[PDB]
Each structure stands twice: as C-alpha cells, then as structure tokens.
Design a protein around this motif. Structure first.
Motif, PDB file in Angstrom:
ATOM      1  N   UNK A 239       0.853  -1.174   0.000  1.00 51.48           N
ATOM      2  CA  UNK A 239       0.000   0.000   0.000  1.00 51.48           C
ATOM      3  C   UNK A 239       0.890   1.224   0.000  1.00 51.48           C
ATOM      4  N   UNK A 240       0.400   2.338   0.528  1.00 54.47           N
ATOM      5  CA  UNK A 240       1.122   3.603   0.457  1.00 54.47           C
ATOM      6  C   UNK A 240       0.964   4.347   1.778  1.00 54.47           C
ATOM      7  N   UNK A 241       1.827   5.337   1.986  1.00 50.85           N
ATOM      8  CA  UNK A 241       1.772   6.142   3.199  1.00 50.85           C
ATOM      9  C   UNK A 241       2.145   7.593   2.915  1.00 50.85           C
ATOM     10  N   UNK A 242       1.613   8.431   3.787  1.00 50.07           N
ATOM     11  CA  UNK A 242       1.852   9.854   3.954  1.00 50.07           C
ATOM     12  C   UNK A 242       0.721  10.641   3.307  1.00 50.07           C
ATOM     13  N   UNK A 243       0.728  11.970   3.490  1.00 47.60           N
ATOM     14  CA  UNK A 243      -0.476  12.744   3.234  1.00 47.60           C
ATOM     15  C   UNK A 243      -0.938  12.665   1.791  1.00 47.60           C
ATOM     16  N   UNK A 244      -0.013  12.460   0.854  1.00 45.02           N
ATOM     17  CA  UNK A 244      -0.372  12.326  -0.553  1.00 45.02           C
ATOM     18  C   UNK A 244      -1.344  11.191  -0.872  1.00 45.02           C
ATOM     19  N   UNK A 245      -1.672  10.328   0.094  1.00 43.82           N
ATOM     20  CA  UNK A 245      -2.710   9.318  -0.125  1.00 43.82           C
ATOM     21  C   UNK A 245      -4.109   9.903  -0.029  1.00 43.82           C
ATOM     22  N   UNK A 396       3.031  13.824  -1.795  1.00 45.13           N
ATOM     23  CA  UNK A 396       4.149  13.103  -1.210  1.00 45.13           C
ATOM     24  C   UNK A 396       3.635  11.825  -0.579  1.00 45.13           C
ATOM     25  N   UNK A 397       4.110  10.680  -1.074  1.00 46.63           N
ATOM     26  CA  UNK A 397       3.767   9.399  -0.489  1.00 46.63           C
ATOM     27  C   UNK A 397       4.853   8.378  -0.793  1.00 46.63           C
ATOM     28  N   UNK A 398       4.928   7.351   0.059  1.00 42.63           N
ATOM     29  CA  UNK A 398       5.878   6.263  -0.114  1.00 42.63           C
ATOM     30  C   UNK A 398       5.127   4.967  -0.346  1.00 42.63           C
ATOM     31  N   UNK A 399       5.797   4.052  -1.040  1.00 44.15           N
ATOM     32  CA  UNK A 399       5.319   2.690  -1.203  1.00 44.15           C
ATOM     33  C   UNK A 399       5.661   1.908   0.065  1.00 44.15           C
ATOM     34  N   UNK A 482      10.350   5.755   3.621  1.00 41.40           N
ATOM     35  CA  UNK A 482      10.746   4.828   2.590  1.00 41.40           C
ATOM     36  C   UNK A 482      11.339   3.530   3.088  1.00 41.40           C
ATOM     37  N   UNK A 483      11.337   3.284   4.387  1.00 43.07           N
ATOM     38  CA  UNK A 483      12.017   2.099   4.893  1.00 43.07           C
ATOM     39  C   UNK A 483      11.232   0.817   4.647  1.00 43.07           C
ATOM     40  N   UNK A 484      10.002   0.905   4.158  1.00 39.79           N
ATOM     41  CA  UNK A 484       9.190  -0.280   3.888  1.00 39.79           C
ATOM     42  C   UNK A 484       8.996  -0.506   2.396  1.00 39.79           C
TER      43      UNK A 484
END
Ligand code: SF4
Ligand code: SF4
Ligand code: FES
Ligand code: FES
Ligand SMILES: [Fe+2]
Ligand SMILES: [Fe+2]
Lengths: 633, 633
Positions: A239-245, A396-399, A482-484
């Motif tokens: 999934x994804x994380x951070x406010x850009x979701x 801004x979001x991370x995988x 980004x650690x995941x």
C-alpha cells in the motif's frame, strides 16, 4: 520547519497552518517552554492533598516529601503509575475485543465472526482449551472466557503471560514474584501501593512495576490474538503512506485511535457506499489510516496510512479530510477545535473517550454496520460542503510493503526451509549476515524532531546488517521515510542483510527482496515480536536474555510506551528509550533500571537522547549478546 | 506549636523533637513552602513524556496542554486518578480480607474463623446467597466468592453497591450509567480514559469519577462486612486515647495502618505473652492503636488509641514506643528513619508495602500466631534495650466511648422502640431535638492546624443539635479532644440533642448519656454510616438526597479521602471538604462538582477552608433538607 519534523509533507502543512493562524502541537510545545524541571526529573508528587511536593534535584531544601517520601520512592511511584496506566490502555483494548468475540459467537452481532479459524484453534491449543469434537463457536466462547478471566485473580496466573514466554523465562520471573495474578488486579495493586503511606522502598516498588508491565504484555498479546481471530491474521500487503494518499476528488475518511472493532467495519461498509459517494460528486470513499487503528487496517487490508502520532493534526490542515473517526488513545484533543477551521467532521465512538466539540456516535457491535453508514454519511455531507474550496494535499507518499505478522514471517522463512522455518534466520545470525534484531516501537514526541531518532538509528543499524522490525508509530515513521519499500534495500541495507532479504523475497516469488524494515503491526502487535523472539529462544534452547535482540522506543511519548519498554526489559531485552523518562531525579532508581535489573531479568534500559550514540549503544548490546553465544561480531 | 497542632500531647512532643533535632512532618512542610501553584490548582499534567504540561491559572501562555488538553480536561483527569487510587486502597484492603475469609473456612488458617455468625447470615441474605440448609463454612465460602467476584465484570453489576443502597438510589445512578461493573474494572478504566489522547470532556470524565467512587464505596462496605464476620461486629466499648496511654513500664506496641488481619491477632497473642514480658522486666504488653488499624481494634476490643494521622511520628518521640507494626496506608515513611533516633523497632508485614530501613516480617494468615510472636519478641527485645533511659510520655489522655456500629446504634435505639428502632431517631429529627446528621471522616492534613477544623465545626454543629458521627482520623481527632466522653455532653451539646443522647443512654442502662459524638469506626466503616443513612431512607420512603444528612472531610489528605467525598456526593449527600482539592484551576469542573452534580445525584461538594464558615454552610445544607421535607428549622 525541519526543526519540527523531518517529514516533508508535515513541513508543507506546518507552513499552511502558520499562514492560516491554526495553532499546532509544535506551537503549544513552544508555549510550554521551559518545562518544569521537577516534573521532568520525576521529583514531584501529588499523591495526596498535602502536596504538591517537590524535591530539588540539587541544592538545599526541599530535600524530601512532606510525609517523608524520598526522591527514590517518589520517582519509583510515579513510574509505577505510568506503567499501570499503559497496562490499562492495552488491556482495556483487549477486554473490548474479548467482549466483541463473545458477542459474535453468541449470535448477538452478526457483523463480527470468526475470520481466522487457524488462529482460533492455535490459541485454544496454546491455552489448553480442548478443540477435539467442539464447534468453533464454543472454542471461541472458551477463548473469550479465558481472556476475560485473566483480568482478575483465579487458580492460575495470567495465561497470556505464562503461555506465551518460554518455561525458562517464566521460571526466572516466578522466582522473583513477577508473574501477574490478574491484569486489572495488578493495575489496582500499583495504584494502591503507590498511594500515600504505602510502599516506600524503591526496589520493592519497581518489582511491582515489572510485574504490572507483564500485565501490559498480556493485554497486548490478548489484543493481537483476539483481533486476528476476528479480523484475520495479517499477511504481506502493498500500500502507500503519507499525506499524498489523500484524494481531493474523494471523500477522505481517517480512522484514528487503536481499537479496530469499528474501523474494520468502516473499511468494508465504505466499499459498498461507493455509488452513494458518486451521487454526491466524489469518485468514492477513501479510507486512510492514522495511528494504530490505521496500522491495524493497513496490516490486514492495505488501507494507506495518512500520518501518525505527533503530526496527526496536519492531515486536517490539507482541507481534504472530510471525516476523522475516533476510538481511543493517542488522539490529540486539539483535533476537535482544529476541525472548526478545517471543516473536518470529527466523530467519537467510544463511551469512555469523548472530546468536547466532537460529534459522538454511540458505537455498539450489535449495530456496527448501521453506525458505519451514519458516520460515512456525515463524511459524504462534508465532502459536499467543500465543493470548490481548493485543498492542499502535499503530493508526497511512499510505497509500503507491510503485513509481517509472526505467522507471515515464519511462512516467508519456510520457503527456504519447509519443516524448520526459523533455522534460515538463525543460520544467518550465526554466520553474521544478520547481526541481530532490533524492534522499533512507540510514538513520536514533540520534543524530538519528528522521526529523526527512528530514521537515524535505523539507518545505522541497517548498514550493520541488523534485522529491523517495527510496530506502532515507529513503523509509521519508517514507512513514511521509505524504509518499507523494497526498492530502497540497496541504499539502506548492509551486504549481508541485503543478501538475506533478497533470498527470502526471491523464494516467495517477487523477484525482489523483502523491504528493509518488517512492519509487524500496531502497538499491541509488539506482542507479535515477542512471539517471534520467544520462538527463536525455544528453537535455540536458550532464554531471551541470551539472544542478540534489542528494542528501541526511540521517540517514546505515551504511558503505553513506558509499559512496553518496561516489559521489554522484563522479558530479558536491552531496551533503548530516546526521550527522558522522569527518573533522572533519582540515581538509585536510574541505576536499578539501567543496571541492577540485569541481575533480575537480564534486560535493562538504555537511556540515550542522541540517536547516533543510541545506535552505537544498541549495536554494542547486540554484539555483547553475540559474544555471549560465542559468535563473531 | 499550637500553630502546628491543637493537641497538647503533640505540642509536648514537638518541643522534644525540636530540642533533639528530629525532623517532623511539620518541618518537612515548612521546607516545602511555597508549594507549587500549578499542582495546587490542578493545572499540571504528567500523563505522557511530552510533559510536564502546566497551565497558568491566569495570564498568558501556557494556556493549554501540548496535546490540546484543556484546563478542564487536565483537572478532571487528575481528580479521576485520585479517586481510582483511593478505590484501589479500600478495595485492596477488602480483597485481602476476602482471601482471608476464604482461607479460614477451608481449613488453611485456623487463627481465623467465623466470629460473627449473625453478620455472615445477614450478609448472605442481603446478597441472595441461600442459607437454608447450608453449613456456615459454605455460606462463608459463597460470600467470599461473591466478594472476589465484584472486582471484575460478570452478569451482575457490583453487588456491594446495588444491594446496599435503596432501589430508588440505584435507579437514579443507573439512569446516568454510574453503577460500577467491577471494582478493579473501573479502576483500570479510569487509568485508561485519563491516559493521553483518550477521554477529553469534563462531564464525561467526571461521570467516570462518580462511577469509580461507587467502586470505592463497594470496597469500603465489603471490608467492613468481611472484617465484622472475621473479627466481630463492634458494640459499645470504653477505652482511652492520646499519648498518655503509653506506659513506661510496659512493652508498648503500636498497630498502625488499615487492615487488621494482622493486628487483631497481635491483640490476642499479646495477652498470652504476658509472663514473657514480665520476665524481661515489663508489667506486660501494652498494644496501642495508631490510625485506622488502631480504630479497628479500639472498636472491637477497646485497645486504646495512641495517636493519629499527621502526628503519628510523635508517638515515637516519647522514647517509649518499643515497636510499630505496619500494614499499609497512611504510614509516614519518615517513621523508618526516626526509629534510628528513638530506638523504636519499625516492622512492615505486607509484601506490597515495604519501607527502606524497616524490618520486614512476611505475614501470612496460615502462620499468623507465629508471626505475631516473632514481632512481639522483637518488641520485648527493644523494651529491654531502653532500661534506664528516661522517657517523656505526656500525661494526657481522654476517656473514649466507642463501638457504634450501625447494628449497635439500631440496638441502642431499640431500647426506646423495640420493633421500630429507627423511629425514635426520626421522631427527634422531625421534632427538632436532632437537627440533622453530620459524618466527619478523613484524615488530618499538615496544612491545617491539627484537629482545628474537626473540633471547630463539630462544636458549632453540636450546639445546633446535630447528631454527629465520625470515622477514621476524624474520629481520632474528636476522641483526642474529649468528644467521645459522655461527661462532656453538658458542655458540648445543645439541649435537644442532649435530651436524645440522655434518653438513649439511660434506656441502655448507664445512667448517663451517649457520648457527644458516635464513633462508627475506621475509614472503610464509612460504609456503616451509609448503612444507617440508607436504612433511614428506606424507613422514610425517600432517597438519601432528601435526608438532612451531610458529610465533612474537614482535613482531608489521602486519595482515599477524595474517593469517599466523591461517593458521598454520588449517593446524594452535601459533602464538605476543608482542604483545597486540586480543582480551582478549572471553573467548569468546580461548577460541576459544587453545583451541576446536584441535578445528577442530589449531592454536591462544599469547598470551604474556614471552619466557622464551613459549619454555617453545613447547617444551611441540613436546614435546606429539613425545609424540603416540610420540617421546621
Ligand atoms: S504522598 Fe507524600 S510526597 Fe506525595 S504529595 Fe503527599 S506528602 Fe507529598
Ligand atoms: S497528556 Fe497532554 S497535557 Fe498531559 S503531559 Fe502529555 S501532552 Fe501534556
Ligand atoms: S512542581 Fe512541576 S511537575 Fe510538579
Ligand atoms: S508544575 Fe508543579 S505540580 Fe507540576
Ligand atoms: Fe498507538
Ligand atoms: Fe486511615
């Protein structure tokens, strides 16, 4: 703003909050400086109406409490109450799922069910509950009865301690009288013994704290067990994380808090109210996660994480958070007043956790689907009200690859060794490809630039081939940076650890490695790390205090965090805390918790506020354990 | 020294302590001044590691907690924890007697027995436990099982609330969700809901406090019930109080604390070790009482009270206190260090209540007579060591008529009306000979000159014909100042109240009146006053919030006192507190607790530090209740 948070999305929203005049957690912190030195050191007692009593850390009078309570009693009493409060939150969470499970299999709340039958049967076997010839509903009745039974005294100690740690560890704790007799029984005993004119010996007081921290462990493990039965044991998910979701064109609904009894239902019901959001002009309903309830539905369902902990207000500042659905724990009550400015509908749902200015919806399992639709309809109403108001979602979001339950980790390792799945992990600890294991747990804390300790320490450990796992807002921190994401393995991981993550990933059919950090779930799911570590201990034939495993509450905040750190120590782990707990006012207490306790449980606190130093200290702790097993380091 | 204590014996020992260089509770208080204003007002929170947070009562920032917790949340959260701590002490006391009673009737601890069979059978009937055709040991097993069952959730609410208040009062509390579900369950729920990021609505928080105060009531009433079964229901007894009950030529042994499971055995065993003290050169063994354990053995056995509460150190300063035998609660931990100077052997006996520098004797009911002799032998050893050291026992003591259990009061009133014993009391309330009833409860507090509020208020109420009853250290105060000596009735009592006390005394064959104040026992025996008041309510057919009954925690100190005051309010009583609880930092919270709560439960706090004003306010409260019943005033 980089002094407030290392997260660029948070920085963006802090600039927005500043030009709009919306006060933040960081603004309230600045307005509190300088904070009270007696409080910070633990040299303050308000346990009777003769106080407040304080003790000068140094200098002249006051040297002692009015009743004669010394610095070391005062400090140990304050610490014991925080452990008991943490235990009260984790065990209250667990108790509520026990009642939910009991209701499910008695026909009372058809929105709940036994979803993981394997887990139910394995828990029953672990507890001694017969399964042969029983209906699932009846085994589950027995498991919920046993869960509720562990809160009070009975003919057995707390089974969610004695059945989840190795016999060798239980024996060590029993010799010192540290096995809890009942979860709420120990909470009450702490509050009693710490009340005025009762226990006044630091060692005796802290032994009580250790026992009550094991009551907290029991509630954590019970919560994970019950939530897995009810909602499904996590398996790997992307999934994804951070406010850009957040999605401007959708109805954005945050589930926030800790207990997922509600938000798991919100997840499923939202998927159907899809055409009803379309009728209001949205593309659909976008459930996003905040804090540990977010972790729960990310772990099980891949719901994207919006934000965490200290930065939770910033989700509202985007202007696109139509609804924030609250249960209890770690919810800044500022959210209720910020919603006036941001238009967000803030909704409480738990009777013992209300916030003035928030709409309350009296959740009951018996009506969960109906309560779900009432809430989601209020959210659809708010989306309609922000037609044509620009929003500012940082892009801004991370995988995030998550879902690493202990069962999932064992299964992933089983692809390298079918009938002995822990062995591939132990093999690579022995040969040095894995230096050790570090669990990151706990909260952000406004005192620390957001995520700075988690990411600084994790980076240094990953370069030294430490297997890193994470829960709660520590996992929230690492996912947002980004650690995941397995694409960051080359950058972040030492050669040997990369080799192991790659081997395991390739053997599970993904042609790429496991992510750099393994997400083991919410705060109660720190119990999952205990399961893994105890399984390792048993597979190796040694106690946990001989394993190259440590924990880091690198940015601790909540009384829950203090309770977890304390039972990490109590089950035998070296345990770093990156914020000052209120203990420095007493050298004798500090010396017990960072040194003498080693001779009781084998673990100990490592208090270190500088993250580069903390990592060096954690690595020395890992390498000492390696040397004690005769391994190179 | 009259600024420190109104008790002339205490004054004498304070002069001795001063010339000898022994620091007292009063010296430690002076060294603490000025105390912290944020603490005193309740505007301080340390419930997470982002704190300490404080709020300026007035002025500029800080105005709000870092997490957004307002003044009213912070104040209500601190108050809720103090109630939960008080409940933890009273219910822990009760739980221990439940286990003691269970052990007794299972053959495990022959030093304990069912001593009051009538009480056992009446408690069983009150609880619904069948008695017809059962052995006493089995009824008692059922009563102890039911006692232990009230600590956790089950199919019924807490029975030591719902069976001890009138159905009308239970219904009022149930409508507002204030009936406790389990005693330790409510303690834990408080600690959870008050932890960071949970409950943040003052009214919701204080409703939780009310419910947990009823959990405290339940523990109080359970403790009284169980202690009566085990040790005998009090009946009227004559003894003495104050330091002059110490005897230079005897082995003086103080029993101090709250739970009498030990000191009741100490009492009986001492009587036999008599010739063994004579062999050491003493006349015998003189057990004397301190604090509520002292009250327990004074009520049942006529053991003389030595001192109380704030002045407990002064007993040691005489030089004649050979041993101080401790259980838990209200014990100044200074006693352990003062004993170095005074030669007193200080002995702890409860595992969760140790004091550094004290000898510990691991009490167990199964070995009570043996532990008793080990302790009394250490005391005989200390008496021998003070051969030829002069002592300074102030030659000051009062005559004390005590033992007024509710059963004793009913029996005393039965001599004026055999089949309707409450009627003579009601008759004289109606006709004005008894203006109302006032319960004095709670501790001394170093902030108040010792006993000054109790005696000032009591004097003014007695002159206005108020029936005065007293428990705990309020009863300790009044006994030490002659209020329990019937020879002071002429001086102290209004004509109408004198007439009633005289009538009742003469009818019970003593040619003199009842004493001016009725001693109803220890702090848990505040439950006895509830029994009496609820019986009056039921005999009158009205709720407690219509009765001319009030309570005064005139010099409150312990978290237990806060819990009692809160359930006094919750069962419908106007409730004075003579020390500032930490609530003035929040007007909304103050306004709930002193005004709005009236619309919930009918009771309310009266916060008044000036005792002459407090009495005027209590009398106005009594007279308002009189007027509401249509009685002259
Ligand atoms: S318990 Fe002792 S140290 Fe704490 S406030 Fe009361 S007198 Fe002061
Ligand atoms: S709970 Fe809130 S008000 Fe209390 S210390 Fe933590 S941040 Fe401050
Ligand atoms: S004096 Fe500041 S925390 Fe109490
Ligand atoms: S600031 Fe003094 S009690 Fe906390
Ligand atoms: Fe959390
Ligand atoms: Fe007491």
């Amino acid at each position: 703003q980089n002094l407030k948070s290392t997260d660029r999305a948070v920085q963006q929203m802090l600039d927005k909050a500043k030009r709009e005049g919306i006060q933040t957690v960081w603004d309230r912190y600045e307005a509190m400086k300088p904070q009270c030195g007696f409080g910070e050191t633990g040299l303050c007692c308000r346990h009777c109406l003769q106080g407040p009593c304080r003790i000068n850390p140094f200098g002249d009078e006051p040297k002692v409490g009015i009743c004669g309570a010394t610095a070391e009693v005062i400090v140990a009493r304050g610490l014991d109450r925080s452990i008991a409060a943490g235990a009260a939150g984790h065990s209250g969470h667990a108790k509520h799922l026990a009642h939910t499970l009991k209701k499910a299999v008695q026909g009372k709340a058809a929105s709940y069910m036994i979803k993981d039958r394997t887990k139910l049967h394995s828990i029953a076997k672990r507890l001694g509950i017969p399964t042969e010839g029983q209906k699932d509903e009846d085994i589950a009745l027995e498991v919920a009865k046993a869960a509720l039974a562990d809160f009070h005294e009975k003919d057995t100690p707390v089974l969610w301690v004695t059945t989840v740690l190795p016999p060798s560890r239980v024996k060590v704790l029993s010799a010192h009288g540290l096995i809890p007799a009942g979860i709420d029984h120990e909470i009450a005993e702490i509050m009693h013994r710490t009340s005025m004119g009762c226990d006044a010996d630091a060692q005796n007081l802290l032994l009580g704290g250790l026992r009550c921290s094991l009551a907290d462990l029991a509630g954590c493990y019970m919560g994970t067990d019950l939530a897995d039965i009810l909602f499904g044991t996590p398996a790997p998910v992307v999934t994804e994380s951070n406010l850009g979701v957040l999605k401007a064109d959708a109805v954005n609904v945050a589930v926030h808090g800790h207990n997922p009894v509600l938000s798991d239902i919100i997840v499923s019901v939202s998927k159907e109210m899809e055409n009803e959001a379309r009728a209001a002009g949205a593309t659909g309903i976008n459930v996003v996660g905040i804090c540990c309830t977010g972790n729960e539905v990310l772990m099980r369902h891949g719901i994207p994480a919006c934000t965490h902990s200290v930065s939770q207000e910033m989700a509202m500042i985007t202007g696109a958070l139509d609804a924030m659905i609250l249960d209890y724990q770690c919810i800044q009550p500022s959210v209720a007043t910020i919603a006036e400015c941001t238009g967000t509908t803030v909704i409480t749902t738990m009777e013992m956790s209300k916030i003035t200015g928030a709409t309350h919806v009296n959740f009951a399992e018996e009506a969960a689907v109906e309560n779900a639709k009432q809430i989601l309809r209020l959210a659809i109403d708010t989306f309609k009200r922000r037609k044509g108001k620009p929003v500012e979602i940082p892009n801004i979001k991370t995988k995030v690859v998550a879902g690493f339950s202990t069962e999932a980790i064992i299964n992933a390792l089983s692809k390298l060794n079918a009938n002995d799945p822990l062995k591939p992990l132990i093999d690579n600890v022995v040969n040095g490809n894995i230096r050790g294991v570090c669990l990151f747990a706990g909260c952000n804390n406004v005192k620390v630039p957001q995520d700075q300790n988690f990411t600084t320490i994790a980076r240094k450990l990953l370069k030294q081939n430490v297997l890193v796992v994470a829960t709660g807002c520590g996992a929230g921190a690492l996912m947002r940076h980004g650690f995941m994401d397995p694409a960051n393995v080359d950058e972040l991981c030492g050669d040997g650890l990369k080799a192991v993550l790659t081997a395991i990933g390739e053997a599970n059919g993904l042609g790429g490695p496991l992510p750099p950090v393994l997400h083991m779930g919410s705060c109660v799911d720190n119990s999952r790390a205990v399961a893994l570590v105890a399984a390792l201990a048993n597979r190796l034939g040694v106690d946990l205090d001989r394993l190259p495993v440590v924990a880091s509450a690198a940015e601790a905040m909540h009384e829950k965090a203090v309770a977890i750190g304390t039972w990490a120590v109590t089950i035998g782990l070296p345990t770093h805390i990156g914020v000052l707990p209120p203990i420095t006012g007493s050298l004798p207490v500090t010396q017990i918790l960072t040194s003498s306790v080693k001779d009781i449980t084998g673990g100990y606190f490592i208090v270190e506020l500088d993250p580069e130093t903390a990592a060096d200290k954690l690595l020395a702790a890992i390498n000492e354990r390696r040397a004690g097993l005769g391994l190179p380091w």
